[model samples]
Target: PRYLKGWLEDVVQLSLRRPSVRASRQRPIISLNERILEFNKRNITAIIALYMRKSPSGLDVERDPIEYAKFMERYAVGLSIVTEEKYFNGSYETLRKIASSVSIPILMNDFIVKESQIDDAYNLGADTVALKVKILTERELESLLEYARSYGMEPLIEINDENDLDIALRIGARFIGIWSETLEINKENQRKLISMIPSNVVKVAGGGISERNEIEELRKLGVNAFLIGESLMRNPEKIKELIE
Candidate 1:
C-alpha cells in the first residue's frame, strides 16, 4: 500500500530546486472545454512503462516525448504527461516536447508542494496542473490553485474521498479528479460522491474505470469527464468502444 502521504513529500522535496526551462516559442492557447469535448474524447496519460525498455527496442518508432505524443494527439482531446521523476520516471522535458508537438491543452501531472513547480509547469508549456487534495493542506491547495490560474492555466485537483471533496469545494477548485482507486467502496457510494459535486464544476472519474456500462453509468450521474488508463492503453479498440 504505497501511501499517498510519503510519495508526495518525496517528490516535492526533489522539486524545491527543480529547473524551469522557458519554451522556445510561445505555446498556442486552447480552452480546456473546447479540447476535452465534455467526456466524448478522453484525456491521455503519458507515463512510460518499464516494458518500453525491452530487448531489441532500438529502431521502434513507437515514440517518446515527441513521437509518443504524435500517437496521443489523435486520441486525446487533452494530453496529460506525468512529470514526477523518481517514481513515474517522468520529466519536464517530456512535457515540453509533447506540448510543442500538439495543439491541445496539456495537463501537467505532478505532485506540486512547492509554489515554484507551478511556474515550472507554465514555463514548460503546460496548460493545466495537478494539485492533489490529499497531499496539500486547504490553504496550500488554494494558493497553488490560484498560482496556476495566474499563469493562464487550470488546476486539476485530485481527491480520494468526500472529506477531500469538502476541502476542494471550500477552496473553489474547478477541475476535480475523483480517483476510484482510492474509493472503490461500492456503486451507490461512488454515486453519492459525484452527487456532492455542483453542476458548475468538472468531475473526472479514474482508476478501475474501463468497462462500457461502467463509463455509461458515470455519464448518467453528470460527471464532466473521465481519466481512464491501463485497459484502454493496452486494448486500444476498447477506447473506441468506451467512447462509442
Candidate 2:
C-alpha cells in the first residue's frame, strides 16, 4: 500500500448528488475515455497523479498544475490530476483549472470513500476518478463504482496484488491501473503482474517509471497506457523522446 499502517485512520471523509453545477460546454464523450478505447503495439500515455506537494521535489516542482499539465498534453493521451487536499495536496479547483484548459480526458486522482467525491470530481469537469482497492472493501468498491457511473464518470480501479485484481475484475472494472509500486519490486514480478490481467481490459502502468526500456518492456508485455509523473517532472522534455 502507498499509505502507511493506520494512515487511513489519520484522515477520512460525501453524498450522491447529481452534477448540475458545471457549464454546458463540457464534452459529451469524455475525450480521455475515447482516447483510451484502443491499444496498438503501445497505444497511449497519460500524466497520472499530477498534484501539488509541500516540498520542492514533488510538492514544490509543480506550483501551478496548469503549467505542467498544459506542457504534458502535447504528448499525453489523457491526464490524471490529484484532488485530495490533505495527503496528495490537491483540490477540486486544481483539476478544474487544468480541465478547462484542455479538451482531453481529465481523471480526478483521489481517495474517494463517499459517493459525493465522485460528484465533486465530475462537477470540476473530471470524467474519471481513482478507486484504490487496498483502502476500500469489496462492497464499498462496487457501490462507489456504480455511483461513479451515475455522473457519467469512469473510475480507474487501482490494484496492487492478486486479491485486489480479483476484486476489481469481479466488480466489472473496464479500466485498471497496476500500481507501479508492485511492478518496481522486481523484474520477474513485473512480468508476473501484467500477465495476471486479462488482455481485454485497459491496463495503465502507474508511476515509478524511470527510463525508456521500462516503458518498452511493459509495451512488450502489452501495456495499453502509462500513468507517470516524477521522471517526466524532472525532465519534462524527455516526453518527446518517448513519443517519437
Candidate 3:
C-alpha cells in the first residue's frame, strides 16, 4: 500500500507543476464551493481544507499559495481555514486577508482547546468555526457551541461515526462535515454512512469525492453538500456543474 508520502509526492508534483523548488512552503487549497452553496443553502458545500500549517505532513512546493487565494475569492461562500499549532507564521494574516478580501464566511478550523484560540479567529476575521467531536465530549461540545454563539460565530462540528453523530445530536447544530478518510474503510462505506445521517441537518460528505456520478449518489444518500480537494482541482468544470 502506498503510504501518504509516496502518493502525495506525485499528487503535489502534478498539482504544483514546479520543476524546481526552494522548499515546500506552498500554501493550501482554499474553497471553490461558494457558488454551489448559494445555489442551494440546503447543500452546505465547502472548499478543500486549505492548510497553511507546516508540519512533517505539509504540502509541496508546486501547490501555489496564490492559487489558494484565488480559490477563496472565486468559490468560497463557506470555508474551513485551518491553522495548526506551530510557531507563528504568516498564515494567520493570510487567513484574515482571505476572509476580508473575499467577503465570505470562513471557519477557523483549529484545535479549539483554548479560549485564546476562539478570540483569535474573530480577531483574525473569521465568520464561523469548527471543532472535531473526537476532541470533545458531549458536554464540552455544548459548552463551546454556547461560548462561540455568544461571539456570533456558529461552530461546525466534524463527526467520524455513529457515536460522534449521537454526540452531534446532543449539541444541536445541523451543519456537519464527515471526512471519508476517517473511519470509513472504503468509498462505498462513505456513501452508506452518509445515508444514515438525520435529514434535518445540513450534511456534507467530504474526502475522496472524485466522480461526478458519486456526487449525484451523495445527493441520493442524504448528503446536502460536499467538501472536496484533488477532485475539484482536477475537474473544476465538473464541480461547477455539480453545484448547478
Candidate 4:
C-alpha cells in the first residue's frame, strides 16, 4: 500500500535526520553486556533521551560542529538508538557506532513489538531497549520480556500513566520511563500517580522536564533518573547547570 510505503519512508527519514554515527573518527568498544556491567559498577542513575525528532515548536539542530560537541559533552547522558521504524538505510549501523563512541551507556529506544527485534537490537549493539506497555498485550510482553532477558538486554518500559506502571511492575520490569506531560498536567495529580510505583526499579521521567522546579518535583515524585531531550538539547547551558 502507498500509505504503508510512505509511513516507512517517514520512519527512515526520522532515523537519518539525526544519524547516530555522526563521524567516522568514533571508536567502537564494549558490547551491550559490557555497558550494562559498567552501568551497574558506576551506579549510573540516569537514562537521558536523545530524541532525534523535529518537533513543531522549532526544535531542530542548528548548532555547528563545535557547539554540537559542547552540547553533547554536558547533557547527552548517552546516545539513544531510537528504532520505531525499520532497520534499513544504514540507520541500524549508524546507531551502533553512536553507541560505540559514547562514554555513557547506550539504549536502543524503539517500539519493539516482536522477538525478531531482540535479535536486531543485539546485532546493533544496544544495552537497553524501550518497551511500551500500552501498545503491547500482556501475553506478548510476557514472552518478549523473557526473550529480551535471555539475550541479556535490559527492557525499559515506557509509561505514560498510572496503569502503565502497574502493568510494567506486574510483569517484572526493572526500568521505566514516564512522560511528565502525561503525568503532571498538574503537580498534585502527578504525585499521586508517581507514588504508586516501587523504588526498586529505576524510574526515568521525561516528556516535559524543562526547569529546575519541575525537575525537583519529579525527584520528589521518586523519579531518580531523567530523559531530557527537547529543553536540554536546545539549552545546553541550562542542562549543564542542572547536571550540577
Top candidate on TM-score is: 2
Model 2: per-residue lDDT, tens digit, 1-244?
2333565545453112222244433655374544666435345443343444432224355456777778876777777786656666666666777888877678877777776677667767886888988778889999998998877776789887888889999999988888732134455655677798888887887656766777887878877777776666666677777655
What is the C-alpha lDDT profile of model 4 across 1-244, one tens digit per residue?
0122454445534533443322332333333334433444575534364544333234354433234433464455555544454332224655555555455556777656656666666666666677767666777776778888887666777777777677788988876667632233455545665677787676666666767677666776677666766565566566655655
Per-candidate clash tally? 0, 3, 4, 0
| RMSD over all Cα atoms, model 4 | 6.4
Pick out the ten consecutive residues of candidate 4 with the lowest summed lDDT.
Answer: 21-30
What are the RMSDs of all candidates, in order? 5.8, 4.1, 9.8, 6.4
* TM-score, cand. 4: 0.70
True-vs-predicted CA distance for residue 173, candidate 4, Å: 1.2
Q: State residue 81's C-alpha deviation in candidate 3, in Å.
A: 1.8
Residue 93 of model 2: what lDDT? 68
Sort by TM-score, top down from the best:
2, 1, 4, 3
Looking at model 1, report the run of 10 residues with the lowest lDDT sum: 46-55
| Location of the lowest summed lDDT over 10 successive residues in candidate 3 | 18-27
lDDT of 1 by residue, 18-115 (tens): 77666543764565644454334443321211112111212222234565456655555566677877666677777777778787677888778887
Quantify all predictions' global Cα lDDT against the true fold.
Answer: 0.66, 0.69, 0.57, 0.58
**Which candidate ranks first by lDDT, i.e. highest?**
2
Residue pairs in steric clash, candidate 3? Answer: 16-62, 31-47, 34-75, 34-77
